[PDB]
């Protein structure tokens, strides 16, 4: 009794966040190839985010022979195909089948450094327009070659939120950041996984989610000398970069003996958030 | 084979300094205890890294192995081979203290990447006349870090004034004269006699 199998890539998703990838003012999105590789070597999305399938999704994936693999910057799904070929799924797929994955957070400081107003809202991504009880606008999960970051366009509240959580059949303990839903056939050919005859596409679909970082005014407090000073413009919070402040002109009301002082960059553990400016307090 | 293994090891470290485009760092085989002796040897030691042998041990697990050879209907008898472990030091003696700490990082980086050395691996000059006895070898290098009591023992026999240093342990130099003691023929006739006791 001989038994054989063959597996091929089905879908790729790119998971990024500026807090870990940018270097001070330098934007990851504008880096060259060597610069990009260098930053990626220190990044692992699992440091802050947890991703897993719903119970129904797991059941379906077993039935259709779909597997879930992960890498420090991405997720790849793979599918069993017929022996002798590259593009015919072993089991027939239908247009309205879908997979649902849930997002949750492990990093307690996510909300301090991530520039997104998540208060009382659900974050939702998909490749097909939903049917919800209240009027809303919709944009799909962005493709790998598109610009932009996660914003308010992906947030839901009230009845629309309630509806989506119920359809996904979520656990009473909640703790969900958001929901990702991918359909075999989406709202346009470039967002679909399969062709009209069920054949896998000949160009792997490649989707992206990218979070932006928060900026703030830095305030320096010197208790022994009894003086306070602030910077003139906001600077970004990053994990690994460094901004050098060394001119009197950089500050509002700089100290008499500025030349003998050193001004450290702030952490993202404590921050004041207001409707206008954000502030970071640093003690000398 | 003690001199030939250490001469091969000295060439591999000097080749690694060449690929990094460092033209000041060279390793020399001499003894560390004469750095400040001020008698005719110290002038060679200045502004260099020095490799030296500080101890010898014997491998115990291979001590009782036999070494006889059977061929045809004839046996030749030989003595068992001797196997030796070494303990080595790399001592940096540069003019600047900052330059010695840079050379010690390079030596630690080199043995992190390559730890096995064979007759096919290495780049020493085979044509050299002092190296005419070497045929086949294999040894490993392993980093050794001593406690404060052990450092007092080691530098107690080298003067009493330490230098920036790393310690390594070398495995299995084989020493064997391979000489014949005897030759005899094997058993070909068996006779059995029985009596009623």
């Amino acid at each position: 009794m001989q038994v054989s199998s063959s597996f091929r890539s089905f879908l790729k998703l790119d998971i990024l966040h500026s807090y870990f990838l940018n270097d001070g003012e330098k934007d990851f999105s504008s880096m060259n190839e060597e610069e990009s590789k260098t930053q990626l070597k220190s990044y692992n999305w699992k440091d802050f985010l947890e991703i897993y399938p719903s119970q129904k999704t797991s059941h379906m994936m077993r039935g259709n022979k779909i597997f879930f693999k992960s890498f420090n910057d991405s997720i790849i799904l793979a599918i069993k195909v017929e022996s002798g070929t590259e593009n015919q799924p072993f089991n027939e797929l239908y247009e309205d089948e879908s997979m649902t994955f849930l997002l949750s957070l492990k990093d307690q400081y996510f909300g301090n450094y991530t520039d997104l107003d998540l208060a009382d809202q659900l974050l939702y991504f998909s490749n097909k327009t939903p049917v919800l009880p209240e009027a809303f606008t919709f944009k799909p999960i962005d493709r790998i070659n598109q610009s932009g970051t996660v914003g308010e366009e992906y947030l839901y509240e009230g009845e629309n939120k309630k509806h989506l959580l119920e359809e996904a059949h979520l656990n009473p303990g909640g703790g969900v950041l958001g929901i990702i839903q991918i359909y075999m056939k989406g709202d346009t050919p470039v967002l679909s996984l399969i062709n009209n005859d069920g054949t896998l596409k000949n160009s792997l679909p490649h989707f992206k989610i990218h979070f932006s970082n928060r900026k703030s005014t830095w305030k320096y407090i010197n208790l022994k000398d009894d003086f306070e000073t602030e910077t003139k413009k906001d600077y970004p919070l990053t994990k690994f970069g460094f901004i050098l402040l060394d001119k009197k002109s950089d500050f509002i009301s700089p100290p008499a003996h500025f030349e003998k002082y050193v001004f450290p960059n702030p952490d993202a553990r404590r921050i004041k958030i207001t409707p206008t400016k954000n502030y970071s307090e640093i003690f000398i | 084979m003690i001199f030939e293994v250490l001469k091969i090891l000295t060439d591999e470290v000097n080749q690694n300094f060449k690929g990094l485009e460092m033209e000041d760092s060279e390793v020399v085989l001499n003894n560390v205890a004469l750095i400040d002796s001020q008698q005719d040897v110290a002038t060679e030691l200045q502004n260099k890294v020095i490799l030296s042998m500080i101890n010898l041990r014997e491998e115990v697990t291979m001590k009782n192995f036999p070494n006889n050879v059977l061929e045809g209907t004839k046996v030749t008898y030989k003595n068992p081979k001797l196997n030796i472990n070494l303990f080595l030091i790399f001592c940096a003696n540069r003019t600047g203290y900052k330059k010695s700490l840079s050379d010690l990082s390079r030596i630690l980086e080199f043995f992190q990447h390559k730890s096995v050395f064979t007759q096919s691996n290495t780049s020493f000059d085979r044509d050299l006349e002092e190296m005419e006895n070497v045929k086949n070898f294999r040894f490993t290098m392993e980093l050794f870090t001593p406690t404060f009591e052990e450092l007092n023992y080691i530098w107690g026999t080298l003067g009493g004034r330490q230098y920036p240093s790393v310690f390594y342990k070398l495995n299995l130099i084989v020493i064997d004269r391979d000489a014949t003691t005897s030759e005899e023929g094997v058993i070909t006739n068996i006779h059995r006699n029985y009596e009623t006791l």
């Binding site: 038994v3 597996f7 597997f67 693999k69 790849i76 793979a78 | -």
Partner: protein, 96 residues
């Protein structure tokens, strides 16, 4: 039944490196399953060594070409028990 369990054991390695570390884990998983089936009486043989075998690896089931292609070859044998169907009773008079 045996195939369902073994299949699940090897599917765990779909995108894993094809090397000695994998081959050892795959073999160990399969043998533990078969030992338990033997212990329960499913298989024939005085000791597991007589009930089944498993082979995985370069030089046993694979060559250089498989390493290049990305194949993993697993070979398994099993000693399976067969039923009696016909019982024949022979009668005679006792001599004495």
């Amino acid at each position: 039944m045996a195939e369902e369990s073994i299949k699940k054991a090897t599917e765990q390695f779909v995108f894993e490196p094809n090397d000695g570390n994998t081959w050892v884990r795959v073999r160990a998983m399969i043998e533990n399953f078969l030992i338990l089936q033997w212990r329960a009486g499913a298989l024939a043989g005085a000791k597991p060594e007589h009930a089944f075998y498993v082979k995985v690896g370069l030089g046993q089931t694979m060559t250089a070409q498989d390493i290049l292609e990305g194949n993993m070859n697993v070979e398994i044998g099993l000693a399976v028990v067969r039923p009696a169907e016909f019982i024949i009773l022979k009668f005679s008079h006792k001599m004495q």
